[PDB]
Amino acid sequence: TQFKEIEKTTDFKNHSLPLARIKKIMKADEDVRMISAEAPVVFARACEMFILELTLRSWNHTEENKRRTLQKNDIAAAVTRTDIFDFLVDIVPR
């Protein structure tokens, strides 16, 4: 996967996912004590990249089956083939 940044008028920032909500998701692990303010900043772009790749790999399976609607079984196929997505197999079994 080749990620690339698009410099672009009409974006207020360089991310579009809420830092405060990222922080709450990291804090639900009760073993997490303290979080630098920079860590959610990293995750806000990392989550966008992860969403793009998982969506694209799922859509590859959609097109393979001659469909124009992304379905949950397409996500399941993408999680099954992509080694870095192995941590998701319980989340999307099929």
């Binding site: 692990d29 860590a39 990293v42 992860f50 996500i75």
Partner: protein
């Protein structure tokens, strides 16, 4: 069998932001089922917890209390997100300028 749970909204990214990203990488008239929208939104939270846990575990081994941006990139790399590291590192470095 089965039992019930509550799906708390403050434990996931807002669905609108997630959907809007998904459509940037899909053809104009592609459709996304309701289950898919929820599933992607769940995978995102799992992704945060997966990477945070790896980073937090090392902090505990090193008796540090604060998860740093560097711990995040180290954990992403240790867990095999190789294509992610250079874009996030440059984004982090420009953020700091």
């Amino acid at each position: 069998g089965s039992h019930m749970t509550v799906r708390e909204q403050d434990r996931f990214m807002p669905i609108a932001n997630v959907i809007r990203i998904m459509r940037r990488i899909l053809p104009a008239h592609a459709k996304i089922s309701d289950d898919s929208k929820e599933t992607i939104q769940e995978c995102v939270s799992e992704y945060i917890s997966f990477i945070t846990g790896e980073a937090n575990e090392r902090c505990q081994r090193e008796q540090r209390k604060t998860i740093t941006a560097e711990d995040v990139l180290w954990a992403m790399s240790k867990l095999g997100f190789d294509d992610y590291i250079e874009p996030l590192t440059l984004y982090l470095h420009r953020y700091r300028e």
